[PDB]
Design a protein around this ligand. Structure first.
Ligand SMILES: CCCCCCCC(=O)OC[C@H](COP(=O)([O-])O)OC(=O)CCCCCCC
Ligand SMILES: *[C@@H]1O[C@H](CO)[C@@H](O)[C@H](O)[C@H]1NC(C)=O
Ligand SMILES: *[C@@H]1O[C@H](CO)[C@@H](O)[C@H](O)[C@H]1NC(C)=O
Ligand SMILES: *[C@@H]1O[C@H](CO)[C@@H](O)[C@H](O)[C@H]1NC(C)=O
Ligand SMILES: *[C@@H]1O[C@H](CO)[C@@H](O)[C@H](O)[C@H]1NC(C)=O
Ligand SMILES: *[C@@H]1O[C@H](CO)[C@@H](O)[C@H](O)[C@H]1NC(C)=O
Ligand SMILES: *[C@@H]1O[C@H](CO)[C@@H](O)[C@H](O)[C@H]1NC(C)=O
Lengths: 49, 476, 97, 49, 475, 463
């Protein structure tokens, strides 16, 4: 797992660190990015995968 | 017997030809091209040279801002002391267009207590209870001040997501392009469409003096609380200066003749229902009469209430530098058109009462009237099964397919599936299982079972009717 | 009466369905063997195969990538397209009614 | 994948707008320990067995 | 079985063979590719390099001026005075002609209320309200009205209205430079005002390899509401028939057909004088009368057409004028329609002779006895169909362009049965009473009216079989 | 004895199914599609947006020859089988009778292509075989049946070279001198490839037709040929399946001879025995052509080493496609015999009896229906046959009507081509087929079913 960071600025640094440190090229069975959203106007959650 | 039937048929034929003349007059020669050119000028033009998006395919709020100061201004003002504008060198732009905004207030939505640290603003969905009524931004003019519905001479609209009020924050644009561009730029700079906005309206009208036909244009953009943009449009041709040519007088004469015919039918109906046959409803040829009379009376009342309320035209004609209010007339014209179409359809259906002049036509009518009961009895079960499938599809596929999003849309999708007008990709990718099962079982049980049982019933009824008439006639 | 007939004429519908399935299997085998021959030549093979799948072959009206995905859906689609065969069921039902 | 995330997803997570976040995202990878070999073009339609 | 029916069969087969030869000899291949290449050259070519607009998608008057000076001059004049070969095979005959029809300012009655703001009104096109006065630099023939009789013109029946054969015309040149200069001077002095209602461009080519003239006519209509409506017509004709032996063979076949028609006419006349007077109570006699009258009409059209070749001789006398071949193309289209109808009827006349055994006889009797009930029910079916078509016309008749005209409503209703209608436009045209019409129409067509036809056919067929079996088994 | 004769039929069917699976999963279609995209859809040069499928002029053909053709021809990777050949067929000036009215305006006209009007004279620089007419027998050619005519196959021909530079120089020389005059009527390009890293052969023929009016018409033909090579147990398994199929054919033929030895004429009155002989003859023809076409492997592999001559692999393609459309018919007929074996229960029994009783009336009404169908097709051909492209040829009219029955109408072109009598044809055809003609087969079937049920019910009553 990789948490991608919290702030926008550090997130780019984490992304490029994963780019240039031999992370996804070789083995990489899957990537599995996932997100969640909240809509309080209608009170609905959303699972994004 | 038949002697009075001849008189009844003659009167019905005169009524039918009068109605046909009236409908041909109301639906005149090709005004389709008028609305065609207007729509293609405003709906199909890309918002800019680089972008390929238009009004019909709006995606975000920035696209709306690009369209407003963009394709709209290009299609509104045409060059040819502050001269008017002719859109196609034929259509005159009446007065000025108007833009309007409907928005909600911040705090009409209670977020959970344990989450009140990362988020602090929630905007509810649109409702008259939660509508904003306070000034905002640089509060200078009518664009940053709430104006009531009765002060705007407005009314409801019944858009797609909800029904929108006639109030909001409005702004009247100008007659020249530079002034309107400056106004729209000033609106965009001092941010006018924030997260609280819920609907935007643009209204204007044109004349096209060559033919005598006004056109009212209304464009609506809805911003749902869940995000996105939903565009819609409404172009309506009207006629408010009717009495110009001879054909107009001919149509007026046909109108008063139609009124006299309706009065005659009402008098006949009352006279016959009063004296005898106080039950009067076991015929199905008398319910049609009352339905036709009611529809025609409603149409006459709507026409009377609509043609006499042309005061807005008089107010506009004494000051042509103001926005003309023509939405009510368009709404009532649409209602009148719907009622007239239904009435003429039923008048045409009424012709079945008189097509009986030989043994071939009598037996077909007898067969239809005899099998109507059995057809209704089986259609109850057919519709129960149809609605079961519709509700299952609505509950399962309703949130992913764009074609099962509403119950009526599910019904229409099923009716299209009957015609073979379905695409299997979306229904399958929405659900790997229970997707193919639904489609296959529906098609099989609808074409192999339900469609053939109707034929069985109809054929049995027709066979027994024909056989019993043949036996009675051959043995008398 | 209605439901009763639907219960009394069931084996006939099963037999009709089985016959139609076997006939469809035979025709599908013929079409698959005919189509996978060569590129356009305007010959009699495409003439005989053009009695289905819109335009002398459209991968059995459901694309091959979608063909190896729930073939029951493709069966339903082909039943919908050739819905005139299902009228044979009426031949049974009327008699029972 | 990396340009798509750096251009689309990142302006959407920290890009304050409607539908709040409710928890940071995550990226989880499967290694498979059995580094795969490229195959000839072929008809593709592989079941990745 | 006996000699009379055998003679009738032999005569009918000979007549059918003659018609088959005659129709085959006029609808060969290489005629489709001629018009196809011509259409691709003139219609699909963009008006200019920087624009993707072509003739088929014209939208304004400036687009028309771009097309006239653009793809038209590229497709008409090809470099090897010199003559122009279109595809190095097609020879451009004479010069093309351009002609406009316009109405006069003041052909309206502007309402008194708005009389102070709008001063100009031009009515929709009509013969009674069309301009007949000079305008602009009134020196040439492009600024002077020329009557229909002086232009040898005729009506056209365009998309919006039926246009007259008169108007303001101009004859172009044989070389690209002169035509370009002429069109430039015609555009500089504004020739297409707000009163312009229609524009026509006409020319022709020969293609001497095969013997087939081609006549090209392009029309652009300007409605009173603003816009452009383009339409085209490419038509091949043969006017120099007797060039090869096959043409003499076709002429001999035509003479044989004329003799056959005369024989049938005299037979039919000789029948109804006293013998079976009012014999119109049979289908095979009304069919014969229809075939005879259609063939007589076709023969008369052909005689009146082929004897009118004075235009070709006049053009051949002086090859620097405009060839007028529109009437020949119109009459050729009419003759083709009549020939197709009569060949269809003579083909369906074959059912009079297929009765060689009991199966064919039973099927023929069943079809014969189904006619009355099917007609009686078709009356009701078409009543309901017309009611639905009128409702759809009144509801969607201004937004959906499948219901924009009553006949278009009928065709759209017929196409709905086949299930090739979007339903997306009629959903948004009217959210209520739009879907209601669609669902109710589908339910009443698929579930109540098809099964009625099938039931009638079933019952009639069973009754016919029973009656025939009783008749045959009780000898 | 039916059960014993059931298991043999199921074994025959499963063997045929294994053979069918081997045939269909040969993965030859992918190679043809890939190389078709390589040669056809590839643009001539990136400066021009055009390809072979959308050729429009003679100069476009010249660009294609020295261009995408030379690029794809000399590069997943393919190996040339010698030298490609390019030939043309042309007519002669003077095969054309100008009417005397305008004989002074036009001097040259060339007729349409025909054997009588063909040209057999030298032209241009009479150097080699590209400027000399060589008869059909000297090129081992045959007819073609192209789009608009049937082409003899003699022409003026030229064989290219092995390297790209030599062929480019030859094409440049052929374009410098005007090889494609106004009299040119057809052009053929033929070659064959191997695709070294796969066990396949392919033959490519590209045709360009120049009509007497103008423009060009392109057409293509790719035919794959497979030679049998044993590399795994799958190959041996399929060889065993083929030999078992041959043995089963021998069993059926000997059984049929034994049965017919005592049934001189009481054999053809049935239907399930008349189908057996058809199956046998189709199978033995397929076996014969398969064992014939397989005796050319040494010829196929004799050209890939160093040969610099044109290989004529055309009759191989003809026999291969004959085998391809024989196998489908034979498997269809065995799957039809599967109906013969399904008569186990009274339900299927009465269904089969109904069909067998109503077949004759079905045939008669099919005759009437096809008469009416052909009348409508002829009317459509005569009315829309010149401007619609869906009615250009009679067979195209028939197929368009068949697609109309299955709901595939366009109706824009139909109504545009003829505003009156165009919609009339469509409306009348739809009304008379959808509502009347197609509802008459069902009447016959329903009546036969009722008669069969009544007969069975009355026979069962006293038994
Ligand atoms: C085997 C080919 C089946 C394809 C039928 C064509 C599809 C079709 O739509 O025809 C169905 C037809 C009813 O008319 P319609 O559905 O065409 O409007 O109903 C019929 O006419 C049924 C006739 C077929 C019965 C023959 C089966 C041996
Ligand atoms: C919305 O209201 C909340 C209080 O509920 C406040 O904290 C927040 O700043 C407001 N947001 C605005 C005015 O944009
Ligand atoms: C509403 O109508 C009145 C006249 O009845 C007019 O004076 C007023 O200006 C209108 N409202 C607006 C916002 O113009
Ligand atoms: C057009 O007609 C009006 C009607 O009075 C007239 O005033 C005007 O001068 C005419 N010409 C033009 C160019 O408007
Ligand atoms: C119309 O036909 C006559 C007949 O000779 C001819 O003289 C005249 O020139 C034609 N009209 C035009 C405009 O050429
Ligand atoms: C074609 O033949 C005609 C007939 O003699 C002749 O006049 C003409 O010069 C020839 N053209 C060529 C290019 O050979
Ligand atoms: C047949 O062989 C080649 C092509 O197969 C051809 O060029 C040659 O002229 C023909 N004759 C002989 C004897 O090779």
């Amino acid at each position: 797992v990789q948490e991608l960071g919290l702030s926008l600025e550090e997130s780019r640094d984490r992304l490029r660190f994963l780019q240039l440190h031999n992370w996804l090229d070789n083995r990489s069975r899957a990537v599995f990015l996932e997100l969640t959203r909240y809509s309080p106007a209608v009170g609905l959650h959303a699972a994004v995968t | 017997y038949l002697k009075s039937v001849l008189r009844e048929l003659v009167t019905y034929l005169l009524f039918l030809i009068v109605l046909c003349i009236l409908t041909y007059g109301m639906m005149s020669s090709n005004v389709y091209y008028y609305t065609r050119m207007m729509s293609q000028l405003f709906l199909d033009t890309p918002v800019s040279k680089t972008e390929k998006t238009n009004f019909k395919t709006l995606s975000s709020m920035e696209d709306f801002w690009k369209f407003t100061e963009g394709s709209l201004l290009d299609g509104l003002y045409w060059k040819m002391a502050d001269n008017r504008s002719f859109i196609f060198y034929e259509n005159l732009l009446l007065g000025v267009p108007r833009i309007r905004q409907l928005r909600v207030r911040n705090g009409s939505c209670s977020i959970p207590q344990d989450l009140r640290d990362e988020i602090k603003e929630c905007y509810d969905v649109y409702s008259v209870s939660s509508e904003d009524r306070a000034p905002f931004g640089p509060r200078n003019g009518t664009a940053w001040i709430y104006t009531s519905e009765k002060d705007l001479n407005g009314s409801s609209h019944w858009g797609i997501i909800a029904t929108y009020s006639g109030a909001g924050y409005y702004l009247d644009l100008s007659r020249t392009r530079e002034e309107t561009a400056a106004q729209v730029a000033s609106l965009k700079k001092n941010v006018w469409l924030d997260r609280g906005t819920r609907a935007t309206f643009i209204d204007f009208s044109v004349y096209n003096a060559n033919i005598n036909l006004f056109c009212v244009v209304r464009l609506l953009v809805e911003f749902p609380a869940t995000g996105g943009v939903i565009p819609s449009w409404q172009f309506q041709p009207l006629k408010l200066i009717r009495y110009v040519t001879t054909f107009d007088f001919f149509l007026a004469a046909c109108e008063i003749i139609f009124c006299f015919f309706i009065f005659y039918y009402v008098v006949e109906e009352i006279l016959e229902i009063r004296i005898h046959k106080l039950h009067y409803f076991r015929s199905f040829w008398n319910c049609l009469d009352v339905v036709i009379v009611v529809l025609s009376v409603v149409a006459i009342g709507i026409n009377i209430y609509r043609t006499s309320n042309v005061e807005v035209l008089l107010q506009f004609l004494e000051d042509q530098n103001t926005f003309p209010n023509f939405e009510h007339l368009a709404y009532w014209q649409i209602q009148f058109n719907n009622i007239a179409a239904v009435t003429v359809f039923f008048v045409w259906i009424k012709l079945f009462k008189f097509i009986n002049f030989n043994r071939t036509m009598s037996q077909l009518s007898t067969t239809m009237s005899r099998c109507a009961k059995d057809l209704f009895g089986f259609a109850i079960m057919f519709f129960i099964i149809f609605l079961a499938y519709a509700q299952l599809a609505y509950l399962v596929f309703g949130t992913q397919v764009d074609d099962f999003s509403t119950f009526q849309e599910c019904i229409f999708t099923q009716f299209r599936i009957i015609l073979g007008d379905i695409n299997f990709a979306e229904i399958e990718e929405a659900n790997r299982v229970l997707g193919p099962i639904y489609f296959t079982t529906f098609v099989f049980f609808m074409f192999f079972i339900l469609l053939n049982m109707f034929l069985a019933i109809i054929n049995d009824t027709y066979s027994e009717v024909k056989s019993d008439l043949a036996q009675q006639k051959a043995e008398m | 009466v209605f439901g009763k007939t639907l219960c009394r004429a069931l084996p006939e519908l099963l037999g009709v369905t089985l016959g139609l399935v076997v006939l469809g299997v035979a025709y599908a085998q013929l079409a698959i063997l005919l189509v996978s021959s060569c590129v356009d030549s305007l010959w009699s093979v495409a003439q005989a195969l053009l009695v289905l799948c819109p335009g002398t072959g459209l991968s059995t009206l459901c694309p091959a990538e979608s063909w190896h995905l729930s073939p029951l859906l493709c069966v339903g689609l082909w039943a919908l397209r050739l819905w005139g065969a299902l009228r044979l069921g009426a031949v049974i039902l009327r008699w029972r009614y | 994948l990396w340009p798509w995330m750096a251009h689309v997803l990142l302006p959407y997570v920290h890009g304050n707008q409607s539908s709040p976040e409710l928890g940071p995202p995550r990226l989880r990878q499967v290694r498979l320990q059995e580094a795969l070999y490229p195959d000839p073009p072929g008809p593709r339609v592989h079941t990745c067995s």
